[PDB]
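Input (Non-structural protein 3):
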Amino acid sequence: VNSFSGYLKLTDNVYIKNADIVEEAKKVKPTVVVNAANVYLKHGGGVAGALNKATNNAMQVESDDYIATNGPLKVGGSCVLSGHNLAKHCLHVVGPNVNKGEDIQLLKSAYENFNQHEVLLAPLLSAGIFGADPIHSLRVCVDTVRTNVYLAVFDKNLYDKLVSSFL
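Output:
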């Protein structure tokens, strides 16, 4: 049992809610919140910009140290950093960015990172400003993630379309 509330069950292990991931995280304080990261951990926009702002830029400061020590992530890759005031941990996952010409086939590899965590609060990878089709991202999520994933979709119109088109 966990405290996630108001989710619709899509499959045994995938749940979805029309919610602001920042507010979900602040309320639930999950063990893991997923960030829609880029390889440089530059949290400027989309989900990353929102999560970082909610940490008053502490996520960015921590990320800058991570990059100085380790260098960039790979597309499809991830790292675990602090969740600050949002969660115990933040799993920074890099989905392909179609607006950078990156190969959407790497989306499955990106979602595989979720399987290293028994429970996650997450956005749909490669959606929003990353340019991929969110319906396809949800399909890959369902077909890749085996651990328990609670998806937060802020945009109500998109949420409704994701539910109504789910196979």
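Residues 58-70 form the longest helix (13 residues).
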